[PDB]
Short mmCIF file of C-alpha atoms in Angstrom, two decimals:
data_model
loop_
_atom_site.label_atom_id
_atom_site.label_comp_id
_atom_site.label_asym_id
_atom_site.label_seq_id
_atom_site.Cartn_x
_atom_site.Cartn_y
_atom_site.Cartn_z
CA UNK A 1 87.02 -25.75 -111.56
CA UNK A 2 85.39 -28.65 -113.36
CA UNK A 3 88.32 -29.38 -115.65
CA UNK A 4 87.09 -32.16 -117.90
CA UNK A 5 86.43 -32.87 -121.56
CA UNK A 6 85.28 -35.59 -123.93
CA UNK A 7 87.25 -37.12 -126.77
CA UNK A 8 86.80 -35.06 -129.92
CA UNK A 9 90.23 -35.34 -131.50
CA UNK A 10 89.00 -37.65 -134.24
CA UNK A 11 86.23 -35.66 -135.87
CA UNK A 12 84.37 -35.21 -137.86
CA UNK A 13 83.30 -38.81 -137.40
CA UNK A 14 81.06 -40.70 -139.79
CA UNK A 15 78.84 -42.02 -137.02
CA UNK A 16 77.19 -41.21 -133.72
CA UNK A 17 76.11 -42.80 -130.46
CA UNK A 18 72.72 -44.19 -129.51
CA UNK A 19 73.36 -43.33 -125.88
CA UNK A 20 72.24 -40.02 -124.42
CA UNK A 21 74.79 -37.70 -122.86
CA UNK A 22 73.94 -34.02 -122.42
CA UNK A 23 76.92 -31.69 -122.40
CA UNK A 24 77.46 -27.97 -121.97
CA UNK A 25 80.08 -26.17 -124.02
CA UNK A 26 82.00 -23.11 -122.89
CA UNK A 27 79.72 -21.10 -125.15
CA UNK A 28 76.77 -22.43 -123.19
CA UNK A 29 76.18 -24.77 -126.10
CA UNK A 30 74.08 -27.63 -124.79
CA UNK A 31 74.45 -30.88 -126.71
CA UNK A 32 72.72 -34.24 -126.60
CA UNK A 33 75.80 -36.37 -127.16
CA UNK A 34 79.55 -35.92 -127.44
CA UNK A 35 78.94 -36.72 -131.09
CA UNK A 36 77.08 -33.48 -131.71
CA UNK A 37 79.46 -31.61 -129.43
CA UNK A 38 82.49 -33.05 -131.17
CA UNK A 39 81.06 -31.94 -134.49
CA UNK A 40 80.70 -28.54 -132.87
CA UNK A 41 84.32 -28.60 -131.76
CA UNK A 42 85.72 -29.54 -135.15
CA UNK A 43 83.26 -27.08 -136.64
CA UNK A 44 84.62 -24.44 -134.30
CA UNK A 45 88.12 -25.05 -135.61
CA UNK A 46 88.38 -27.22 -132.52
CA UNK A 47 88.31 -24.14 -130.32
CA UNK A 48 85.08 -25.02 -128.55
CA UNK A 49 85.69 -26.44 -125.10
CA UNK A 50 83.50 -28.50 -122.80
CA UNK A 51 82.39 -26.43 -119.84
CA UNK A 52 80.82 -29.35 -118.01
CA UNK A 53 78.65 -32.43 -118.36
CA UNK A 54 74.89 -32.87 -118.21
CA UNK A 55 72.43 -30.23 -119.37
CA UNK A 56 73.69 -26.74 -118.67
#
């Protein structure tokens, strides 16, 4: 059932990516890059999980 996830076990990071990669968290949280998402994960005590890739 779409069991994937991006690396976010090194945040918060003092940088970001220029590339564009839309993600969709389990909370229906759509992000632009794994950078923003990662920040969301760490921000969410690292409880936030990636539901899938690309815009929700």
